[PDB]
Amino acid sequence: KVFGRCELAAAMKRHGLDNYRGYSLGNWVCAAKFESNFNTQATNRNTDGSTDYGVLQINSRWWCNDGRTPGSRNLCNIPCSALLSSDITASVNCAKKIVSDGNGMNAWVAWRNRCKGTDVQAWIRGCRL
């Protein structure tokens, strides 16, 4: 499913991501834009052999099981294909563990590089939330 900017903002909100660990909604929406272009079906393989899945591009080295990443840890306890669904619930629950992990949203490279220190509020402007 390719979400609309405001549709995604609204679902993320409803899912408890707004201000989750001090990161406002605009942060989450910006990171989703840059990680997957709002497409829940986005996948990207990494040099290490791991793969990023879904709207939030969650890595199979640590967070989910895809059956082909040796030494994966499966911290979110889910198969990686669950992260590709039209329903963002598992992506969200998993992102919440990730962000609680220590480095915050810095875990997301596009967030760090394209979102961080920018006017992220722009991302939810005009939305009915």
Swiss-Prot record:
| UniProt superkingdom | Eukaryota
Tissue spec. comment: In the egg white and polymorphonuclear leukocytes.
Catalyses: Hydrolysis of (1->4)-beta-linkages between N-acetylmuramic acid and N-acetyl-D-glucosamine residues in a peptidoglycan and between N-acetyl-D-glucosamine residues in chitodextrins
Question: Where in or outside the cell?
Answer: Secreted
Q: Which GO terms describe its molecular function?
A: beta-N-acetylglucosaminidase activity; identical protein binding; lysozyme activity
Principal EC category = hydrolase
Q: What functional role does this protein have? A: Lysozymes have primarily a bacteriolytic function; those in tissues and body fluids are associated with the monocyte-macrophage system and enhance the activity of immunoagents. Has bacteriolytic activity against M.luteus.
Its protein name is Lysozyme C
